[PDB]
Amino acid sequence: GCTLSAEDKAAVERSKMIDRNLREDGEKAAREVKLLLLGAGESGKSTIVKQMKIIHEKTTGIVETHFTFKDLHFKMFDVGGQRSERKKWIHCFEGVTAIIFCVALSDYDLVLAEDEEMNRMHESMKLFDSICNNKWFTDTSIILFLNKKDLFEEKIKKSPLTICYPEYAGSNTYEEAAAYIQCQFEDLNKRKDTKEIYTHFTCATDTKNVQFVFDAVTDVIIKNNLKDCGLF
Amino acid sequence: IAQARKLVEQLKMEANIDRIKVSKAAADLMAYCEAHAKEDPLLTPVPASENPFR
Amino acid sequence: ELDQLRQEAEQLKNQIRDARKACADATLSQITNNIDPVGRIQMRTRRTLRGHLAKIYAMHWGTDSRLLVSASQDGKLIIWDSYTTNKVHAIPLRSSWVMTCAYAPSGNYVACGGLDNICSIYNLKTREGNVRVSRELAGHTGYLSCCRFLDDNQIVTSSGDTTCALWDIETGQQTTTFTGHTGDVMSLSLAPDTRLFVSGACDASAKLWDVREGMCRQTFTGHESDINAICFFPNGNAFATGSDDATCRLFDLRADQELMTYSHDNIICGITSVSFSKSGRLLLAGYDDFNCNVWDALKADRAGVLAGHDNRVSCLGVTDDGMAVATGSWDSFLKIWN
Amino acid sequence: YTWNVGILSLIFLINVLGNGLVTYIFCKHRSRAGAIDILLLGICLNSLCLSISLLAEVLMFLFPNIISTGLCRLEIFFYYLYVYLDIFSVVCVSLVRYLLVAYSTRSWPKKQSLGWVLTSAALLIALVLSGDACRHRSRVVDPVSKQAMCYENAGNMTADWRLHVRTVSVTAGFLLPLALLILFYALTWCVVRRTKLQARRKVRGVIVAVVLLFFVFCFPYHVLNLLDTLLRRRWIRDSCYTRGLINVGLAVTSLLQALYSAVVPLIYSCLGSLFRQRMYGLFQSLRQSFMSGA
């Protein structure tokens, strides 16, 4: 303080101005909503980023999407080019506001890329089970999108719900065959008393997915504030 | 087949190496550790008069 | 000729195993039996560096052993003066997912990289007084795990696409590609004479590469899980690795085999970082149990414990003169011990 | 009378252990903190008032001839401050909890500065009312011993000896803070109920507990004070057997408020999940160090 030369005090002043800018940027960055976008193959993940309102601001790893809805800034992270081991970097996304998981409804009879008597829906179920019941994701909310609800309106009129989920008996109808798939995707949660899952039957129009995401994350923010204030 | 041939060639390159005895490498490591005993501020702490982090 | 290739590979493997086995007269734990123990090593924290608002993933010491660089997951590279705790530089990053950082031996450059498959080189000696991006290298198809400077114009990087690369910063083009691993490369350590380097991968193996010609010389196995950290012995004739099975191991280059195993029964977490003291008789390893253990390098017994971090000890470093140890953890704090 | 300082001693021990635990856990993690943590610390640093009051009180039994006009005031001021600061800080805690929930996107509720100014405002109010409380109590001269019974009575002041004191005390202490607590917690619950969160059934229980503890502990003392005042006005006939019951009730009720003020710092932190986890980690790590067995 007092035993400082002319050159010494300038360094302290510079450090104080660096710390001031650092806390300004940190407080700015604490007000944004970070979402992690996940899926299994051609389950969507491409039209969803298009439906997002007011999209506005090479690499082959992280894909970043910025947008704004009702005075809120959303940053969505897409990991599709990362073909390496998932367990070695999945801990990087610990602290994200929510995980947006996309599943294609019109995959209950399609085999995988390599024919191995495996449906494209069971792989989605395993990936959801692994992500949901993770050590790094024990309180992170999941927004589940079931995309191809229109393609699940012609095959379901022909094909039955016996290729996958063989312990099903009921009418071949959009309501009674989708309210069952939603139940099977929601029964994989082993923390039903703490973690919340939001399910939506999206479409390719009506631009109402952004409102659903906003309504889902506006409860996660309240829950986090409730946890930080000692009320829960 | 070409990949396995490259693997075989790599193993061949690894095989033809001169190896010293383990009792000699341990002796060399001990000699290096002993010859620098009075140069490690973490092994033998330096007095507070020459510690930059006092 | 799959059968012939398989049988030749098995014959070569058996020959190598027999040749290495016939070179073990005794054990390092037997030769180092009458030497005096180091005793109890008690280290105290002298400084605490605050200013990061997210988990710190990497750190590196300067050659002068006074300045250090730290990277955290908030898009900031912070350069600290350890003596006075002052901040010298704060570089904002274009990508917030960084897994490694490096410091040039000359001190004029810094390197960064992460989930984006790009290594960014920043210049610290600009005439205007502001750090700007000097170069960007984008020849990798997987996330960068480590990077180390050779000169002001060369750098070696390891990535998650099971390859390593040697670059030319002036032109931004790869000069040599070190392939041969069958898993993601996690760590990388340069020899003291910067002519060889060891790399550890997720296939539970380590390989020794020569920078000039660019081929694998020796392969070391023995670990059961992924090798997270690697370090060179000060002499340069041995190295140490740390795995996810709560075990460190010491390998000798000339003996071409393992020497000693450092493990306990009360430790079941993984090792995130390893380092050697200046003399080479102390091995410092950071764990997931929020602690750092100091082992006697010649007698496989624990000599000290460093505690004080809230979360995983992610990075560990020792200065060139070996006067202090810097540890960075996921609780966004750097601690200097002496 | 011997029991009074004996009972007040246990409150001192409970208060010091609880406040020490809360302060020690806070000091470990103070890099990230909001207004609620600062308010809880401000509540914690009221044990000095109790310590000063107990030191003044204990001078009666040993070294009993120091007492002057100021010393009864020096006891009463710190006792009333230790009482009132808790009550006034609880309302600020409720207000901050409402502000965080109602404005979750904004950043100004989270800032530490806000708690500071709140921690000042209560500190002012608890002083001002305390300034009244000492005023009435007066040095006392008695034929046997002047020291005994620091009492509110002056010479000829029947008009204002207790009614101003108890009316202001009840109105400022138990009727305004209760209304503010109920209002802010109801406003918080109104927005919380709309959400889909699983935690809705726990927040309601926590709110009900925090309001009910304050009501239950604070009400009996004011009830018995009102009963005293109604008695001395002769509105109800006195057998003079009741007077002993009335006084013994007053003593225990004051003791109950003293216990509530000491206990509440630990209760507010313990109900939070993060504080419970932090204390579980401390109990595991520290006991795992010593009594470990090596």
Side-chain angles (χ1 to χ4, degrees), chain D residues 113-130:
Chain D
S113 179
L114 170 71
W116 284 124
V117 56
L118 299 174
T119 303
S120 303
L123 202 138
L124 184 122
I125 309 169
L127 286 171
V128 150
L129 310 164
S130 314

PDB file of all heavy atoms in Angstrom, chain D residues 113-130:
ATOM      1  N   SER D 113     -24.972  -6.042  -2.121  1.00  0.00           N
ATOM      2  CA  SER D 113     -25.187  -4.687  -1.622  1.00  0.00           C
ATOM      3  C   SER D 113     -26.570  -4.523  -1.005  1.00  0.00           C
ATOM      4  O   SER D 113     -26.711  -3.918   0.064  1.00  0.00           O
ATOM      5  CB  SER D 113     -24.989  -3.678  -2.755  1.00  0.00           C
ATOM      6  OG  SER D 113     -25.221  -2.356  -2.306  1.00  0.00           O
ATOM      7  N   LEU D 114     -27.599  -5.075  -1.657  1.00  0.00           N
ATOM      8  CA  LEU D 114     -28.965  -4.910  -1.169  1.00  0.00           C
ATOM      9  C   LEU D 114     -29.090  -5.352   0.282  1.00  0.00           C
ATOM     10  O   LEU D 114     -29.510  -4.567   1.142  1.00  0.00           O
ATOM     11  CB  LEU D 114     -29.932  -5.697  -2.054  1.00  0.00           C
ATOM     12  CG  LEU D 114     -31.370  -5.834  -1.553  1.00  0.00           C
ATOM     13  CD1 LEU D 114     -32.100  -4.506  -1.651  1.00  0.00           C
ATOM     14  CD2 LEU D 114     -32.107  -6.914  -2.327  1.00  0.00           C
ATOM     15  N   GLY D 115     -28.659  -6.576   0.588  1.00  0.00           N
ATOM     16  CA  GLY D 115     -28.720  -7.038   1.962  1.00  0.00           C
ATOM     17  C   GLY D 115     -28.073  -6.057   2.916  1.00  0.00           C
ATOM     18  O   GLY D 115     -28.647  -5.720   3.956  1.00  0.00           O
ATOM     19  N   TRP D 116     -26.916  -5.514   2.525  1.00  0.00           N
ATOM     20  CA  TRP D 116     -26.214  -4.563   3.379  1.00  0.00           C
ATOM     21  C   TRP D 116     -27.132  -3.430   3.807  1.00  0.00           C
ATOM     22  O   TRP D 116     -27.305  -3.185   5.008  1.00  0.00           O
ATOM     23  CB  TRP D 116     -24.980  -4.013   2.661  1.00  0.00           C
ATOM     24  CG  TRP D 116     -23.830  -4.968   2.610  1.00  0.00           C
ATOM     25  CD1 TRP D 116     -23.179  -5.406   1.495  1.00  0.00           C
ATOM     26  CD2 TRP D 116     -23.172  -5.583   3.726  1.00  0.00           C
ATOM     27  NE1 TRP D 116     -22.167  -6.268   1.845  1.00  0.00           N
ATOM     28  CE2 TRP D 116     -22.142  -6.392   3.209  1.00  0.00           C
ATOM     29  CE3 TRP D 116     -23.359  -5.533   5.111  1.00  0.00           C
ATOM     30  CZ2 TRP D 116     -21.302  -7.144   4.027  1.00  0.00           C
ATOM     31  CZ3 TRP D 116     -22.525  -6.280   5.920  1.00  0.00           C
ATOM     32  CH2 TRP D 116     -21.510  -7.075   5.377  1.00  0.00           C
ATOM     33  N   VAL D 117     -27.787  -2.766   2.848  1.00  0.00           N
ATOM     34  CA  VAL D 117     -28.601  -1.620   3.242  1.00  0.00           C
ATOM     35  C   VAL D 117     -29.758  -2.089   4.111  1.00  0.00           C
ATOM     36  O   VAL D 117     -30.093  -1.452   5.120  1.00  0.00           O
ATOM     37  CB  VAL D 117     -29.071  -0.804   2.018  1.00  0.00           C
ATOM     38  CG1 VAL D 117     -29.822  -1.648   1.023  1.00  0.00           C
ATOM     39  CG2 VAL D 117     -29.926   0.375   2.463  1.00  0.00           C
ATOM     40  N   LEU D 118     -30.334  -3.250   3.786  1.00  0.00           N
ATOM     41  CA  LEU D 118     -31.364  -3.806   4.653  1.00  0.00           C
ATOM     42  C   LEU D 118     -30.797  -4.098   6.033  1.00  0.00           C
ATOM     43  O   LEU D 118     -31.387  -3.710   7.049  1.00  0.00           O
ATOM     44  CB  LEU D 118     -31.958  -5.065   4.025  1.00  0.00           C
ATOM     45  CG  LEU D 118     -32.641  -4.843   2.673  1.00  0.00           C
ATOM     46  CD1 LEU D 118     -33.070  -6.161   2.066  1.00  0.00           C
ATOM     47  CD2 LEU D 118     -33.829  -3.905   2.817  1.00  0.00           C
ATOM     48  N   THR D 119     -29.609  -4.707   6.085  1.00  0.00           N
ATOM     49  CA  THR D 119     -28.964  -4.979   7.361  1.00  0.00           C
ATOM     50  C   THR D 119     -28.686  -3.699   8.134  1.00  0.00           C
ATOM     51  O   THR D 119     -28.571  -3.743   9.363  1.00  0.00           O
ATOM     52  CB  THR D 119     -27.667  -5.761   7.129  1.00  0.00           C
ATOM     53  OG1 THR D 119     -27.961  -6.966   6.413  1.00  0.00           O
ATOM     54  CG2 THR D 119     -27.003  -6.135   8.445  1.00  0.00           C
ATOM     55  N   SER D 120     -28.629  -2.556   7.449  1.00  0.00           N
ATOM     56  CA  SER D 120     -28.505  -1.290   8.153  1.00  0.00           C
ATOM     57  C   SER D 120     -29.851  -0.805   8.672  1.00  0.00           C
ATOM     58  O   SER D 120     -29.950  -0.393   9.834  1.00  0.00           O
ATOM     59  CB  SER D 120     -27.885  -0.235   7.237  1.00  0.00           C
ATOM     60  OG  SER D 120     -26.620  -0.659   6.759  1.00  0.00           O
ATOM     61  N   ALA D 121     -30.898  -0.894   7.845  1.00  0.00           N
ATOM     62  CA  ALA D 121     -32.179  -0.301   8.218  1.00  0.00           C
ATOM     63  C   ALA D 121     -32.714  -0.918   9.501  1.00  0.00           C
ATOM     64  O   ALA D 121     -33.059  -0.199  10.448  1.00  0.00           O
ATOM     65  CB  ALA D 121     -33.187  -0.463   7.081  1.00  0.00           C
ATOM     66  N   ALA D 122     -32.741  -2.250   9.569  1.00  0.00           N
ATOM     67  CA  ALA D 122     -33.152  -2.916  10.798  1.00  0.00           C
ATOM     68  C   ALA D 122     -32.285  -2.476  11.966  1.00  0.00           C
ATOM     69  O   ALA D 122     -32.800  -2.163  13.048  1.00  0.00           O
ATOM     70  CB  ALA D 122     -33.087  -4.433  10.620  1.00  0.00           C
ATOM     71  N   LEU D 123     -30.968  -2.395  11.748  1.00  0.00           N
ATOM     72  CA  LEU D 123     -30.069  -1.979  12.819  1.00  0.00           C
ATOM     73  C   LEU D 123     -30.451  -0.606  13.346  1.00  0.00           C
ATOM     74  O   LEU D 123     -30.285  -0.322  14.537  1.00  0.00           O
ATOM     75  CB  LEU D 123     -28.622  -1.984  12.331  1.00  0.00           C
ATOM     76  CG  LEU D 123     -27.558  -2.085  13.425  1.00  0.00           C
ATOM     77  CD1 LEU D 123     -26.459  -3.048  13.012  1.00  0.00           C
ATOM     78  CD2 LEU D 123     -26.980  -0.716  13.748  1.00  0.00           C
ATOM     79  N   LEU D 124     -30.963   0.265  12.474  1.00  0.00           N
ATOM     80  CA  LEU D 124     -31.457   1.550  12.950  1.00  0.00           C
ATOM     81  C   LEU D 124     -32.701   1.374  13.811  1.00  0.00           C
ATOM     82  O   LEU D 124     -32.747   1.856  14.950  1.00  0.00           O
ATOM     83  CB  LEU D 124     -31.745   2.474  11.768  1.00  0.00           C
ATOM     84  CG  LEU D 124     -32.180   3.897  12.117  1.00  0.00           C
ATOM     85  CD1 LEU D 124     -31.233   4.914  11.500  1.00  0.00           C
ATOM     86  CD2 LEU D 124     -33.609   4.147  11.663  1.00  0.00           C
ATOM     87  N   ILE D 125     -33.699   0.642  13.305  1.00  0.00           N
ATOM     88  CA  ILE D 125     -34.990   0.584  13.985  1.00  0.00           C
ATOM     89  C   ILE D 125     -34.842  -0.067  15.351  1.00  0.00           C
ATOM     90  O   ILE D 125     -35.352   0.442  16.358  1.00  0.00           O
ATOM     91  CB  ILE D 125     -36.023  -0.153  13.115  1.00  0.00           C
ATOM     92  CG1 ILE D 125     -36.056   0.441  11.706  1.00  0.00           C
ATOM     93  CG2 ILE D 125     -37.400  -0.082  13.752  1.00  0.00           C
ATOM     94  CD1 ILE D 125     -36.846  -0.385  10.716  1.00  0.00           C
ATOM     95  N   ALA D 126     -34.112  -1.183  15.411  1.00  0.00           N
ATOM     96  CA  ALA D 126     -33.890  -1.863  16.682  1.00  0.00           C
ATOM     97  C   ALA D 126     -33.249  -0.930  17.700  1.00  0.00           C
ATOM     98  O   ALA D 126     -33.478  -1.068  18.907  1.00  0.00           O
ATOM     99  CB  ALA D 126     -33.023  -3.102  16.469  1.00  0.00           C
ATOM    100  N   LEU D 127     -32.437   0.023  17.235  1.00  0.00           N
ATOM    101  CA  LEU D 127     -31.890   1.015  18.153  1.00  0.00           C
ATOM    102  C   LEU D 127     -32.986   1.923  18.696  1.00  0.00           C
ATOM    103  O   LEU D 127     -33.128   2.074  19.915  1.00  0.00           O
ATOM    104  CB  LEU D 127     -30.808   1.841  17.457  1.00  0.00           C
ATOM    105  CG  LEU D 127     -29.460   1.164  17.200  1.00  0.00           C
ATOM    106  CD1 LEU D 127     -28.586   2.034  16.315  1.00  0.00           C
ATOM    107  CD2 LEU D 127     -28.751   0.847  18.500  1.00  0.00           C
ATOM    108  N   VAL D 128     -33.805   2.490  17.804  1.00  0.00           N
ATOM    109  CA  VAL D 128     -34.697   3.577  18.201  1.00  0.00           C
ATOM    110  C   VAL D 128     -35.684   3.105  19.257  1.00  0.00           C
ATOM    111  O   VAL D 128     -35.839   3.738  20.309  1.00  0.00           O
ATOM    112  CB  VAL D 128     -35.412   4.158  16.967  1.00  0.00           C
ATOM    113  CG1 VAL D 128     -36.779   4.712  17.345  1.00  0.00           C
ATOM    114  CG2 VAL D 128     -34.556   5.237  16.323  1.00  0.00           C
ATOM    115  N   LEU D 129     -36.341   1.968  19.015  1.00  0.00           N
ATOM    116  CA  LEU D 129     -37.256   1.432  20.015  1.00  0.00           C
ATOM    117  C   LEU D 129     -36.519   1.113  21.307  1.00  0.00           C
ATOM    118  O   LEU D 129     -37.022   1.393  22.402  1.00  0.00           O
ATOM    119  CB  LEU D 129     -37.969   0.195  19.474  1.00  0.00           C
ATOM    120  CG  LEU D 129     -38.607   0.354  18.095  1.00  0.00           C
ATOM    121  CD1 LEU D 129     -38.922  -1.001  17.510  1.00  0.00           C
ATOM    122  CD2 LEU D 129     -39.860   1.211  18.169  1.00  0.00           C
ATOM    123  N   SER D 130     -35.308   0.555  21.198  1.00  0.00           N
ATOM    124  CA  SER D 130     -34.512   0.313  22.394  1.00  0.00           C
ATOM    125  C   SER D 130     -34.266   1.604  23.156  1.00  0.00           C
ATOM    126  O   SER D 130     -34.269   1.603  24.391  1.00  0.00           O
ATOM    127  CB  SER D 130     -33.187  -0.352  22.026  1.00  0.00           C
ATOM    128  OG  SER D 130     -33.390  -1.415  21.113  1.00  0.00           O
TER     129      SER D 130
END
